[PDB]
Coordinates of N, CA and C in Angstrom, one line a residue:
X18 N 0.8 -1.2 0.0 CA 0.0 0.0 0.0 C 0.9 1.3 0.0
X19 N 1.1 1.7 -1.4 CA 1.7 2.9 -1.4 C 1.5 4.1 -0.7
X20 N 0.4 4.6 -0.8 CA -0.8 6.1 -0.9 C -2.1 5.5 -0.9
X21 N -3.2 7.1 -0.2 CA -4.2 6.5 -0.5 C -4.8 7.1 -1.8
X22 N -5.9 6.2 -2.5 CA -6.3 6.4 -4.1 C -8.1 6.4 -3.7
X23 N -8.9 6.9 -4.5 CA -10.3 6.7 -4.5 C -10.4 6.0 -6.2
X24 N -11.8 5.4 -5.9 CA -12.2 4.5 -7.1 C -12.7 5.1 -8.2
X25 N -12.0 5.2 -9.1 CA -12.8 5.3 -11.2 C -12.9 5.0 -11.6
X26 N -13.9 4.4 -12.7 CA -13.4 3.5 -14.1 C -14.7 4.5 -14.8
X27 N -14.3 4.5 -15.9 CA -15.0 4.2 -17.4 C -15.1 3.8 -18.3
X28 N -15.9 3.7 -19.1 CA -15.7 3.1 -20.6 C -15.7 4.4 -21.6
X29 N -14.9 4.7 -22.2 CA -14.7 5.8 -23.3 C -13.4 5.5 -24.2
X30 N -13.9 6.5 -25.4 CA -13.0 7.4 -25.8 C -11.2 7.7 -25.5
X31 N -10.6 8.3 -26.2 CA -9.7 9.3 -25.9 C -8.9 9.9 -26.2
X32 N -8.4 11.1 -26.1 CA -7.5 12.1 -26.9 C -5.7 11.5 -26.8
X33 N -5.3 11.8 -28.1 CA -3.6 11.9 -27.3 C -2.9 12.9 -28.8
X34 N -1.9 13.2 -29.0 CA -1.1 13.5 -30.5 C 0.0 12.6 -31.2
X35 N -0.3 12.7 -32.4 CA 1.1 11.7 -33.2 C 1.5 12.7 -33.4
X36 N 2.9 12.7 -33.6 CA 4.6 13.4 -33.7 C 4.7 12.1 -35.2
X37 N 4.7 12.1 -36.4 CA 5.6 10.7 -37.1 C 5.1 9.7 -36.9
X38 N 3.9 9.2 -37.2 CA 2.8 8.5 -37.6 C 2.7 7.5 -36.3
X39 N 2.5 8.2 -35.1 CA 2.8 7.6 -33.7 C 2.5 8.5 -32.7
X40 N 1.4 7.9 -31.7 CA 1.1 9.0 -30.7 C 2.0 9.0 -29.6
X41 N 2.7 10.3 -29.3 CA 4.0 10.5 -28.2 C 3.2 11.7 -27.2
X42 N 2.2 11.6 -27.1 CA 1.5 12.3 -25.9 C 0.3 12.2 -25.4
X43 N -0.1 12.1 -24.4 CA -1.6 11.9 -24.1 C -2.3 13.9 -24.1
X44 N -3.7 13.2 -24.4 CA -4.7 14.8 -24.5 C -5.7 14.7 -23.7
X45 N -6.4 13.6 -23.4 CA -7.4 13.6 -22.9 C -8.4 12.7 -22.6
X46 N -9.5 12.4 -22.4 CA -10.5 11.2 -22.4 C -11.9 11.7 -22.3
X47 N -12.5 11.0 -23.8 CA -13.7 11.4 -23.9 C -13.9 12.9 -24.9
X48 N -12.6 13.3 -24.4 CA -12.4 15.2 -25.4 C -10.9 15.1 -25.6
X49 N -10.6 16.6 -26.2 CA -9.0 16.8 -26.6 C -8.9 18.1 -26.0
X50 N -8.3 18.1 -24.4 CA -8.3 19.2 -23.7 C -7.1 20.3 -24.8
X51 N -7.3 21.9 -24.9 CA -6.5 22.7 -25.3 C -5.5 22.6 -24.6
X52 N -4.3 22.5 -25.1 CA -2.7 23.0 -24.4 C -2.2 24.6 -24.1
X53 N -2.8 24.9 -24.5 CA -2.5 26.4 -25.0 C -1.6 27.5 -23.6
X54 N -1.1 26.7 -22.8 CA -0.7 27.8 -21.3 C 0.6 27.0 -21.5
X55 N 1.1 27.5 -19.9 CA 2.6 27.1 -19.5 C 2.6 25.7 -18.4
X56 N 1.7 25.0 -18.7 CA 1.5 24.0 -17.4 C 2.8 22.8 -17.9
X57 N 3.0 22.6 -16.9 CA 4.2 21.1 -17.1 C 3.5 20.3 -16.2
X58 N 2.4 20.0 -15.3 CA 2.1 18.7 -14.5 C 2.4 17.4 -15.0
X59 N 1.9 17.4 -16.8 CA 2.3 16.2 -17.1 C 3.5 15.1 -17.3
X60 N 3.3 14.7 -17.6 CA 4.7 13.8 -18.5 C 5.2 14.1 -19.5
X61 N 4.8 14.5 -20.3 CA 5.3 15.3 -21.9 C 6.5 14.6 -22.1
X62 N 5.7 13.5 -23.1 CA 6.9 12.3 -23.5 C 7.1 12.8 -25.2
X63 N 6.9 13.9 -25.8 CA 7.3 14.5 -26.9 C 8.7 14.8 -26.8
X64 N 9.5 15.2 -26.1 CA 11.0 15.6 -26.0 C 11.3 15.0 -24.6
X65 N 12.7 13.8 -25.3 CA 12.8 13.0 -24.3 C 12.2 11.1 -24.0
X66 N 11.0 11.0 -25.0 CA 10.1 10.2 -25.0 C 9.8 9.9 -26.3
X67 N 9.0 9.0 -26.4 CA 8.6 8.2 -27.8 C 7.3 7.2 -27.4
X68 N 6.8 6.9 -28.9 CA 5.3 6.2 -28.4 C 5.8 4.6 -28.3
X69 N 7.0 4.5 -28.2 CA 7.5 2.9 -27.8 C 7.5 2.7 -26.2
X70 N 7.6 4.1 -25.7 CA 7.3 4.2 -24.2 C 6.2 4.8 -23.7
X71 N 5.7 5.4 -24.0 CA 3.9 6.3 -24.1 C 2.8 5.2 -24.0
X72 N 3.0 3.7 -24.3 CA 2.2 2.4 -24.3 C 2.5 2.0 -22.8
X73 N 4.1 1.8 -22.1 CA 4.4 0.9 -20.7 C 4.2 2.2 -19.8
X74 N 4.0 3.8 -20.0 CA 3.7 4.7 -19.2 C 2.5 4.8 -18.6
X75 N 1.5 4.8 -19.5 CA -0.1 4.5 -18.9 C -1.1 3.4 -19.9
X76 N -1.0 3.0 -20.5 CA -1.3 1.7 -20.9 C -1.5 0.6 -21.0
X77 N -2.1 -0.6 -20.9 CA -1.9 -1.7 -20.8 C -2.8 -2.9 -21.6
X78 N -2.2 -3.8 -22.1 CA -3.1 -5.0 -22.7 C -3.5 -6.2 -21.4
X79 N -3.8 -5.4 -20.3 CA -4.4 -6.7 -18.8 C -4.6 -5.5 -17.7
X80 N -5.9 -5.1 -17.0 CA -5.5 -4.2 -16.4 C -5.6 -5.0 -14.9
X81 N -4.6 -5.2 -14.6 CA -4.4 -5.5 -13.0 C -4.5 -4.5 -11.9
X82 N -4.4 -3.5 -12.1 CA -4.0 -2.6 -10.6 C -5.2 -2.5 -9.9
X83 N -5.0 -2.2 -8.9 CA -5.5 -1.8 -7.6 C -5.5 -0.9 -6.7
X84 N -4.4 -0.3 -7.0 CA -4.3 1.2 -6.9 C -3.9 1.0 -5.0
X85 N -2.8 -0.1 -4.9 CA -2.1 -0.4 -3.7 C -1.2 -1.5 -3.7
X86 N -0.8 -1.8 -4.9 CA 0.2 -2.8 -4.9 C 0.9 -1.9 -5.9
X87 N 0.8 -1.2 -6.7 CA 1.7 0.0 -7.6 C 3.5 0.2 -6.9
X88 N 3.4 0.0 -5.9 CA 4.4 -0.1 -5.3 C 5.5 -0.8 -5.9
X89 N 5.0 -1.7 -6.4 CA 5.7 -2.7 -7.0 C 6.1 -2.9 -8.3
X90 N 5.4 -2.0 -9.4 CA 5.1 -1.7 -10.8 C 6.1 -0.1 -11.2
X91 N 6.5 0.2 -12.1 CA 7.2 1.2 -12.1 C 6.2 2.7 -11.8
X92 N 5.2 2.4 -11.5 CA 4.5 3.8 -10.9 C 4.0 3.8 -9.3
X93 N 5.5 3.5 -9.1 CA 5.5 3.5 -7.1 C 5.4 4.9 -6.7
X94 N 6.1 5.9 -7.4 CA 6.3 7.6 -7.3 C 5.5 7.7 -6.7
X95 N 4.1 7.6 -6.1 CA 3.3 8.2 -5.4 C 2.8 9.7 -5.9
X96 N 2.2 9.3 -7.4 CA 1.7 10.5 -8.3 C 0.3 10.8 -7.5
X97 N -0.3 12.5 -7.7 CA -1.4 12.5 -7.3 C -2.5 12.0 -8.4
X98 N -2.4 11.5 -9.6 CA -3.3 10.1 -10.2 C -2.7 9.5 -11.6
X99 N -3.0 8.6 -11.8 CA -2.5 8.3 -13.5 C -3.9 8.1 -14.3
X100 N -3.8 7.7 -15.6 CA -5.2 7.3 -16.5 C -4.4 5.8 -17.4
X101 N -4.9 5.2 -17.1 CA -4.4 3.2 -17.4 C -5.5 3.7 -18.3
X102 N -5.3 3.1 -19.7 CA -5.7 2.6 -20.9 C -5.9 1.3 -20.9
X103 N -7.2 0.5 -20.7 CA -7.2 -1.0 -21.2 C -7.4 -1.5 -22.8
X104 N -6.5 -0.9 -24.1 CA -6.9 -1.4 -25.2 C -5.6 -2.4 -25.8
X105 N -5.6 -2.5 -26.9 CA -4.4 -2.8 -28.0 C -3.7 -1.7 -28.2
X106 N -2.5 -2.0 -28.8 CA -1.9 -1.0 -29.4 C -2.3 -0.4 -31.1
X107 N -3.3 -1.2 -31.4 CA -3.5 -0.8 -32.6 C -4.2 0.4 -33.0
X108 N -5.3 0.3 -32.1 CA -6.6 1.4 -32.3 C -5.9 2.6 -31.4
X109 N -4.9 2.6 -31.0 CA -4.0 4.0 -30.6 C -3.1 4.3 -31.4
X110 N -2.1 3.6 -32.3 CA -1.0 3.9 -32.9 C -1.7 4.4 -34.3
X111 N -2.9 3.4 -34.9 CA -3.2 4.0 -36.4 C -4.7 5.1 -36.1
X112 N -5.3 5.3 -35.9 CA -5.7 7.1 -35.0 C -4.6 7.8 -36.1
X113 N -3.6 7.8 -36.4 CA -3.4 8.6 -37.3 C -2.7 7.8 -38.4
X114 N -1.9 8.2 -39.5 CA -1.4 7.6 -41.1 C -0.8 8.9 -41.6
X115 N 0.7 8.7 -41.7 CA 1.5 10.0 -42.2 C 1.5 11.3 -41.5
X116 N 0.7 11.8 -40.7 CA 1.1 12.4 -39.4 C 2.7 13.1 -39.0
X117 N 3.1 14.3 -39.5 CA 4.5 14.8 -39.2 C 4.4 16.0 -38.3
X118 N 2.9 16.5 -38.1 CA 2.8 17.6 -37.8 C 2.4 18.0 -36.4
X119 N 2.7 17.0 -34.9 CA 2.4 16.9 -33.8 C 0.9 17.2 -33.4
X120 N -0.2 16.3 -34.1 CA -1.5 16.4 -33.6 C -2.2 15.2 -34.0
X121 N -3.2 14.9 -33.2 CA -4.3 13.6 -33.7 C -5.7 14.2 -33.7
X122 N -6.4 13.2 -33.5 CA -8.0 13.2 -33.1 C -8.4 12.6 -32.4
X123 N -9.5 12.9 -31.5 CA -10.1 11.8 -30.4 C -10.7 10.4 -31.0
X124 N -10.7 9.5 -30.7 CA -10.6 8.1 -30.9 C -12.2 8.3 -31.2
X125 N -12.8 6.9 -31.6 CA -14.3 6.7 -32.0 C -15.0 5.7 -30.6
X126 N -14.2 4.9 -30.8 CA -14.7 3.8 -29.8 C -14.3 3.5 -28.4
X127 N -15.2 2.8 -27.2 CA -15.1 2.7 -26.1 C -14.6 1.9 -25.1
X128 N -13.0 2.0 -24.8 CA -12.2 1.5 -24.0 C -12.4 1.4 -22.2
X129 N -11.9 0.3 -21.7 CA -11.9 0.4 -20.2 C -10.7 1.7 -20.2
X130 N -11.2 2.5 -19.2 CA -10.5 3.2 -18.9 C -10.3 3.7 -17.2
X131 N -9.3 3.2 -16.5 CA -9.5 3.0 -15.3 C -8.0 4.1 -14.5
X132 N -8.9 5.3 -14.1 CA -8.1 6.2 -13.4 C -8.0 5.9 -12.2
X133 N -7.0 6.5 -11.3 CA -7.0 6.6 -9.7 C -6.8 7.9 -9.4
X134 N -7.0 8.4 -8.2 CA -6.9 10.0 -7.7 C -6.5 10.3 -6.1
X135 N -5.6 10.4 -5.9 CA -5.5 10.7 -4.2 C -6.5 11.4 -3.3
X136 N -6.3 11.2 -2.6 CA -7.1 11.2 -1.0 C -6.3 11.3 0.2
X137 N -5.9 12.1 0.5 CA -5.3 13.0 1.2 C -6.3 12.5 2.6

């Protein structure tokens, strides 16, 4: 038991951008939040990162967690939440085709999508 977490899941959608026919950032779920300020909370795996790591960052093909054994998984940091993707890698990587110009579109179809959020 890392931290304490409260319970979310849904089924949706979700935003991210391809950089080179490959999504190297997450945007959103359900929508494609604007970037447009000076915020850094994220990960911003665009410099420094790649969508060969953007998949083992919040992603997964089996969603196990529990949001208390993370400890053990490389998201022990004790973030105040992450967003786990339960899909393939397919229906995220092709979301775009020839793509040079750092942007996507929100997805069509409806993934497990299972957040956690601290509780302080």
């Amino acid at each position: 038991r890392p931290c304490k977490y409260k319970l979310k899941k849904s089924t949706n959608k979700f935003c991210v951008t391809c950089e080179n026919q490959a999504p190297v950032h997450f945007v959103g779920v359900g929508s494609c939040g604007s970037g447009g300020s000076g915020i850094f909370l994220e990960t911003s795996l665009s410099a420094g990162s790649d969508w060969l790591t953007f998949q083992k960052k919040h992603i997964t093909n089996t969603r196990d967690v529990d949001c208390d054994n993370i400890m053990s998984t490389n998201l022990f940091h004790c973030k105040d939440k992450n967003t786990f993707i339960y899909s393939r890698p397919e229906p995220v990587k092709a979301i775009c085709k020839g793509i040079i110009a750092s942007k996507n579109v929100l997805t069509t179809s409806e993934f497990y999508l299972s957040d956690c959020n601290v509780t302080s």
